[PDB]
Design an enzyme around this catalytic site. Sequence first.
Site, short mmCIF file in Angstrom:
data_model
loop_
_atom_site.label_atom_id
_atom_site.label_comp_id
_atom_site.label_asym_id
_atom_site.label_seq_id
_atom_site.Cartn_x
_atom_site.Cartn_y
_atom_site.Cartn_z
N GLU A 224 108.39 -26.83 14.33
CA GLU A 224 107.80 -28.14 14.47
C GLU A 224 106.45 -28.32 13.79
OE1 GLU A 224 108.89 -26.16 16.97
OE2 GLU A 224 110.34 -27.34 18.19
N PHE B 116 111.91 -26.78 35.19
CA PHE B 116 111.97 -25.97 33.98
C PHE B 116 111.24 -26.64 32.85
CE2 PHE B 116 114.17 -24.96 29.99
CZ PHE B 116 114.03 -23.58 29.94
N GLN B 117 110.26 -25.92 32.30
CA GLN B 117 109.53 -26.38 31.12
C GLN B 117 108.90 -27.76 31.34
OE1 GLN B 117 110.93 -25.61 26.72
NE2 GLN B 117 111.35 -27.68 27.57
N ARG C 144 82.06 -23.22 -3.25
CA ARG C 144 82.88 -22.06 -3.54
C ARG C 144 84.22 -22.44 -4.18
NH1 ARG C 144 85.33 -17.75 0.82
NH2 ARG C 144 86.19 -16.26 -0.72
N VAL D 277 96.27 -22.88 1.42
CA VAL D 277 94.87 -22.65 1.75
C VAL D 277 94.52 -21.19 1.45
CG1 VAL D 277 93.25 -22.52 3.66
CG2 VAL D 277 94.74 -24.51 3.44
N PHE E 64 91.02 -14.57 0.03
CA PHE E 64 89.83 -15.39 0.30
C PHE E 64 88.97 -14.74 1.38
CE2 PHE E 64 87.92 -19.63 1.51
CZ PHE E 64 87.69 -20.13 0.25
N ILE E 65 89.61 -14.13 2.40
CA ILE E 65 88.91 -13.50 3.52
C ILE E 65 88.43 -12.10 3.15
CG2 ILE E 65 89.01 -12.88 5.94
CD1 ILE E 65 89.29 -15.95 5.13
N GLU F 292 85.17 -12.51 1.56
CA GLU F 292 84.16 -12.77 2.58
C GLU F 292 83.69 -11.48 3.23
OE1 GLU F 292 85.98 -15.71 5.18
OE2 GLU F 292 86.06 -17.12 3.51
#
Lengths: 583, 583, 583
Positions: free
Chosen positions: A51, A113-114, A256, A386, A471-472, A475
């Site tokens: 989802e 339930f749920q 950056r 990303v 990317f990390i 860093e």
Amino acid sequence: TNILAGAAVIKVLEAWGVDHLYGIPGGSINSIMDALSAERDRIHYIQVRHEEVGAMAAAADAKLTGKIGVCFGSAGPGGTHLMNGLYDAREDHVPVLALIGQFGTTGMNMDTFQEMNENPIYADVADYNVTAVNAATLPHVIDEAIRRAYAHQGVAVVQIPVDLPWQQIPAEDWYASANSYQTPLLPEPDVQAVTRLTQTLLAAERPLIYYGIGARKAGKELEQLSKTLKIPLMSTYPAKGIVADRYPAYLGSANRVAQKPANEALAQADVVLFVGNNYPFAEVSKAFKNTRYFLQIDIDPAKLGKRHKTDIAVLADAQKTLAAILAQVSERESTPWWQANLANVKNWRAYLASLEDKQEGPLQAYQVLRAVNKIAEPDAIYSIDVGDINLNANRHLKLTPSNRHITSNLFATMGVGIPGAIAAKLNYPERQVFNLAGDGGASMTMQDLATQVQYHLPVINVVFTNCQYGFIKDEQEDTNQNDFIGVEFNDIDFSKIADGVHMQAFRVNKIEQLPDVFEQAKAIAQHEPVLIDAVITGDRPLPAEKLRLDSAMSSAADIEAFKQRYEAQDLQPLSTYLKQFGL
Amino acid sequence: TNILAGAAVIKVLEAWGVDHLYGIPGGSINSIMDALSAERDRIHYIQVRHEEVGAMAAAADAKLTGKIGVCFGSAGPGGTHLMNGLYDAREDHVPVLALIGQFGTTGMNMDTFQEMNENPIYADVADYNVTAVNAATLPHVIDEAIRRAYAHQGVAVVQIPVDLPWQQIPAEDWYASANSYQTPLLPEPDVQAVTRLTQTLLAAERPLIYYGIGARKAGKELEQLSKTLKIPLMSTYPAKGIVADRYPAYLGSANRVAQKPANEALAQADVVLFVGNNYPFAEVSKAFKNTRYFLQIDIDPAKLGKRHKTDIAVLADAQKTLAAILAQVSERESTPWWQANLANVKNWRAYLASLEDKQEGPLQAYQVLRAVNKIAEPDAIYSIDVGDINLNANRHLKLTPSNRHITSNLFATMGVGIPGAIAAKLNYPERQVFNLAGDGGASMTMQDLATQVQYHLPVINVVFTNCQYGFIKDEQEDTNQNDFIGVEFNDIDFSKIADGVHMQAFRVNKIEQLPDVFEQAKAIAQHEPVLIDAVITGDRPLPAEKLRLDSAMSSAADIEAFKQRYEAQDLQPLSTYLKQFGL
Amino acid sequence: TNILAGAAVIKVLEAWGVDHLYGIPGGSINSIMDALSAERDRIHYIQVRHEEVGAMAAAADAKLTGKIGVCFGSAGPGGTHLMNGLYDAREDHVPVLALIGQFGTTGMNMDTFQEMNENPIYADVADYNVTAVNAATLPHVIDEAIRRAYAHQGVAVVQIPVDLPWQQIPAEDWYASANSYQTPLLPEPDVQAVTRLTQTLLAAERPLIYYGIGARKAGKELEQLSKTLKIPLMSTYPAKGIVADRYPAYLGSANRVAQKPANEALAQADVVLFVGNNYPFAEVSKAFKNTRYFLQIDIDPAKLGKRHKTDIAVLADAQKTLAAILAQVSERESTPWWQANLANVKNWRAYLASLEDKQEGPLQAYQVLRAVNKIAEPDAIYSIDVGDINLNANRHLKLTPSNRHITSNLFATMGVGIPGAIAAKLNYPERQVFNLAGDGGASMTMQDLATQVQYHLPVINVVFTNCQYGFIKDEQEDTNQNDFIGVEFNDIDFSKIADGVHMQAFRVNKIEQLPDVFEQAKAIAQHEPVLIDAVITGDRPLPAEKLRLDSAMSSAADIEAFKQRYEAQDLQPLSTYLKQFGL
Ligand SMILES: Cc1cc2nc3c(=O)[nH]c(=O)nc-3n(C[C@H](O)[C@H](O)[C@H](O)COP(=O)(O)OP(=O)(O)OC[C@H]3O[C@@H](n4cnc5c(N)ncnc54)[C@H](O)[C@@H]3O)c2cc1C
Ligand SMILES: Cc1cc2nc3c(=O)[nH]c(=O)nc-3n(C[C@H](O)[C@H](O)[C@H](O)COP(=O)(O)OP(=O)(O)OC[C@H]3O[C@@H](n4cnc5c(N)ncnc54)[C@H](O)[C@@H]3O)c2cc1C
Ligand SMILES: Cc1cc2nc3c(=O)[nH]c(=O)nc-3n(C[C@H](O)[C@H](O)[C@H](O)COP(=O)(O)OP(=O)(O)OC[C@H]3O[C@@H](n4cnc5c(N)ncnc54)[C@H](O)[C@@H]3O)c2cc1C
Ligand SMILES: CC1=C(CCOP(=O)(O)OP(=O)(O)O)S/C(=C(\C)O)N1Cc1cnc(C)nc1N
Ligand SMILES: CC1=C(CCOP(=O)(O)OP(=O)(O)O)S/C(=C(\C)O)N1Cc1cnc(C)nc1N
Ligand SMILES: CC1=C(CCOP(=O)(O)OP(=O)(O)O)S/C(=C(\C)O)N1Cc1cnc(C)nc1N
Ligand SMILES: [Mg+2]
Ligand SMILES: [Mg+2]
Ligand SMILES: [Mg+2]
């Protein structure tokens, strides 16, 4: 005569022009499902495999078209899976309607339930967040949600107890207010204010115009102001492409996900015209610390003087205001500032071309993006994930006003490449669509490659496989005392993942392999999705926020090391060009 | 002398015995990462491929061991990805600590990149939900979070501005309170109350004992009470295995993830002893509508009389109370009620065996589970996803007290099979671990098959590929007017997905293929993970909540159709056995 | 055959033993009002003048009797007025049910008059927080709310759409679980651990026993342990009275609502037995900085090691644990530590007596409280507001185990004096009840003096009129650089306020006026409420947290100024007494 409330809800969606919507069924949402099932010719339900991809795709629909995106999730875990896409829509301020399944009214608050109180789940993300409790008013509640999502440019969430859409309601009472929708007619910007802004801009020695996506309608005016007045242009990363990248006085973006000339010029500018721009790094990076006058044009009072102390802030439309400035100015001769910036841009673009133009050897991101450029149609749409891909795509894609590109601009959720591409192809089935994604982000939403296959959506997926959260990693290199952690990981072969979902695919690891694979992909994507898994080096891309090229600013040893690591021997600092032209 | 606050936080985790924790790094959490990196010998960081899998795995750690599970997510989208696992932990009432990255204190509330007020995001899910604002108190805040998560059996969330863990704090001031932790010594259940409950139970004509997982310590007592008193046993689905499935008077569970004998007996019982049980279907299904006396044993005052009007509710430990009942009773001769239920169970188990025992032809879920049984060790652990697999595993797995099985019991989030198996193998590296998952649920978390490979976790993954959300398709068959929607979808070949993450795998579609594939998988999983993708039919499993076998209750035409569809020609209704023994 | 759902709800309250409840009607709650009207012979509605007073009174009911308190508010502003009382209940961990009016289900989510989504308003304060959506389940929802509020010792909130209570539901179906209620089990102390605790306590050179209200059942054991072992006692402020104030080794409480001997002894203690105590100042005041060994007894695992690292922690009932300690020790001889503390207490009590025993001149708070003591019955109940009155009442009231006192312990909402006294008189009509309040706090809830008149509740209200927020003035004296602000204000004559609500009253401003006024009030309060407005000086009460008496610690100038300001010429620092006994 009567109508099922669920049928009326689908007719409200239809009245508002909703073409397609996303979700996964469950018992708690099966009465909305039932109503959808009867309306397949007029609204198109897209069954996703997670989802979050439906929520992200709904956000992307609205980013692309300006029309509300629609998604749903079943009670409990269906809905909570929407969150990363709902927060994307909130932060990127686009209209989305989210429907959440709920237990019938006879079982709510029984701890069945749920079954839970779902309203607090969505309170933070949502502009409008209600649990429906009546069938006859349910069409109105959906209509209200849509109208508020549009008006407030954000997320509206409706939790729907599953009994309500199966109840009969009087046929003649419900309505939609889509017929009332319109966009405002605005006054002219006032001549006096435009006038004083304009004088301050023209009196500057080292002016810049720094625009964001609020200037999306103003590309022509931006370029002509730049050319006439001899004022370089810079933008937010998302505003790439509003002015063609080829424009010789386009400096790029700052920080950056950035280009060298923009950072360097911004540090030197005495006056900045900040238009349609909410650059989130302004304060933290001290971007404007030595700017003398700061001028703003924005449509939103909430933004006036927000990012820096502002000398003149005009509340107006960007295009109308920039046109009004253009109408009151005329040619200025070339200046040293203009010439220095032009020279700096040429030097930078020669560096990027040198990376792109390698013909053989270990594959880097740079050559993969050149290969994308080589097969891209002039009106292609790019859904970008990303990570380092934002940085590299920002530098290498050659965009024009005819393109679109989207990412998760501010929430910056990974995984958006796949859903954004799904939405792009659904909206624009005749336009070429790319998904450019790192391996980390592609892996988060990889199952929804199957949705591209299922719906025959001919996306060109390009996965940048570095076996890192690159990317990390960079860093951690910059800040962490101790060894790298969590940033280098095992390989996933996305060509095999693609095969598993029954998508044609290729894996490449050598520069010389690119042309024929990209030509084959271009051809497959006339009719079916395709994936290219590009195995790239671990080379760090040049950090535009940590330039070491200026011998007045940096040691010779630091400059030598920078040039070596970043293949940057031929880059010159802006100060070289300033000096050349006498500044 | 000083210590970095982050180092102190990791020592608090160590003091509480946390062995392993899950997450994905980001700049906003790189100072916790840095502290982890220095402590690899004493705490084991598991880098997942999607943060929801880390949250789910943390929940599963606590389900399995009773020890707090720990996960983290980076600011914004890292943390919001945790939600499905955090809600699982809340609803399954297990202790979890979640750390959320946040921008440094100097940039909070500046509307910088991926910076938001994160506290409202977690307010609904969390028992404890705080944003840390000081380095010196940060170890205490983590300690507090852990202690509350345990005490309150739920989720504690701490948002950590990234600057704080890099600050020095005095070495001698921080502490952990793990040394104080203990479990309570309880009084005896009172003899008088046990005594009156016991008389009511023994006076019944048609008694049942109906237990949940609050009776997990009481399997011996349950079985001996049953045998001595001639009282059949039934359980909640999660309580399967507390008493061995082979026990001839174990009726199974009620409702839908259910077995025929339990539903039928419950409808006839005059007295139910409801012990350690919070069955969420009690009211909505009218389970106890013709029960004469309802007796309860539970440890939690909040549960006393919750699910039905209760004649006697004893606030006590289940084991201690059931032992105290056993100590005051003695043998009763076999009764007609006992004999009827025994006969009904034998008939039902013959039906299930007939499904299992087919030797050739199109593969069904039933034979896949028989094949699992055939390779399962006596102390195997099962991580079970959400869907028809709960129904089928409940019927077919042959569990004993030596096994464990976990799913998302109440939130019922799909995707938990993979993470639960990861957690099981991390806690119990010498025990065999299965992940049993439908295709829909496996696809939601499929990327974290790579985590099993990366950490060399020898899980046996079994994917039940029906190309459906079968559990939901059957719901639509039952309730929906219009055609099926969103419930039938394209194939994913999980053997190819497995190959893509570098896991050995097989795909099967014929009954006769099972023995050799399962034997090979059993062997591979002595050292590495493996996956079996079982392509199964679309046959609906027998609905125990819609039995059509009793000619006093159902038409001959309805019975004929039921018997045909469900291969149930030889099933007899309970009433046949009641009549046989004179009831 | 049918019952109105509202009638059933009131029947649920009656089953749970609710005698009285508070609120103000509105259209949005008129269907509950209608049901109350029919039941006015069996459950008693108290109409307050401001809903906050109803919420506060409900919290006070539970503080006093342990019976869930019940209040309500009309939609929107009626309910939001409850907040200060609901947060008081949360923070003082007492059970309260709050019912909130709501628009009918046909008008919800229409943006009609005073119609909003009310659920998010209550999410933070409440343990349980639901909007009812069905009439037939409404009795269960109320039952659930009550059962949870008790089990979890906090607030349950139910928003009730006004149509539901007017709907007929089957008479036979609903029930209350009051019959099944039990309080949590009392864990028992581990006998080894208690022996180890005892050993450590006895080996101490400077021990203290420091209890809170968790030890409210254990006053006998506390006093006997103190006497047998020669160990001084100190308590939290709320725990005043558990041991009689006259006990010569009762030191008082620490911090600011504090007595000098407790602060001084705590600073020197080597071993503290911390029992039934969650003192919120522990860390911030560095209370235990020099404590060698810390021994804790608490029933709540969330508390163990919370306030300081424990050397022995016992998860058990206070009275059972203290009894087990007492049973294994015998009489010990006097020690120097014991005698030093006894001498310090005598000196302190002589100081307080000197303030109380003035017989003429400008009225101070001290003599007002002596006059209260002189008319107080031995089993009087005190409802105390928030401010200097907590400090002064803690020093001067002469309480025994037969008394009760309540305030807002932790949330510390002003205004509680009046509602707490309303609740006390309702629950204990034959016991004398005082409301002791500052002028600021009395002002906030003054209108509900009318409620005492209306219901003929003979409270003795004593207002301490300093024309200041004195507690806060003193804080500004201590911290602020600039002039006082917001802390000195105009007079209100509460004897005229009382006349306005038709309550007998007196105003006094001189010590010599007290005896006759207080005797008159004592007699009036045999039948009707009364108010005494005591106009007191602006003298600051001695700050036990900023003692200036020890010339080893303080300058002669600061000592002389302190003695003069606080009339403390005869006070000696604890060190005087330590030195006398060789310490
Ligand atoms: C991994 C990653 C890293 C990133 N780092 C960078 C980076 O280093 N550099 C960078 O530049 N970006 C970066 N970004 C994007 C960044 O987070 C912000 O989203 C972006 O800089 C803001 O762009 P904007 O101002 O164009 O858009 P918005 O924030 O959407 O602002 C649009 C502005 O236009 C105004 N407006 C709207 N319509 C009109 C109109 N008609 N007339 C006038 N005003 C109008 C609005 O009121 C608003 O102020 C990154 C993104 C990612 C995914
Ligand atoms: C797709 C799916 C469908 C499902 N449908 C069904 C279904 O049809 N049938 C079914 O049976 N389940 C079903 N479930 C599970 C269902 O949702 C509930 O989780 C389950 O029935 C409740 O089990 P329980 O009472 O054992 O556990 P819990 O809800 O955890 O309750 C445990 C109880 O034990 C008490 N307790 C704890 N410790 C002690 C102690 N020491 N002594 C005494 N009491 C104690 C607790 O206070 C509590 O009341 C399904 C699950 C899934 C994933
Ligand atoms: C204006 C104002 C100022 C104040 N300042 C002061 C001050 O300076 N000094 C001061 O002392 N107070 C002060 N207070 C009160 C203070 O805020 C705290 O409420 C109080 O100190 C805590 O008291 P407590 O530990 O007794 O109660 P609680 O905080 O209610 O804690 C009771 C403890 O007992 C435990 N427990 C409960 N039942 C049992 C059992 N059967 N056996 C074992 N343990 C049990 C609980 O788990 C809990 O840990 C002030 C109040 C006001 C209104
Ligand atoms: C892990 C990570 C990133 C690594 C992305 O790894 P990729 O492998 O996709 O990309 P590359 O850099 O290696 O080319 S970037 C991101 C920042 C910008 O926020 N984060 C943090 C992050 C973590 N989790 C989610 C769901 N979204 C996020 N943005
Ligand atoms: C779609 C679905 C289910 C289908 C699961 O499909 P699967 O393919 O995994 O299993 P099968 O039934 O075909 O064997 S069951 C579930 C109910 C029990 O809640 N839901 C709703 C659901 C929807 N989304 C999530 C994340 N979790 C959920 N529980
Ligand atoms: C103003 C004030 C106080 C002043 C009370 O003034 P009073 O006039 O009632 O009492 P006195 O000190 O002058 O005798 S004490 C309090 C602290 C303890 O929290 N506050 C803050 C406060 C402010 N507002 C409310 C509703 N409750 C509060 N507790
Ligand atoms: Mg990568
Ligand atoms: Mg399936
Ligand atoms: Mg005052």
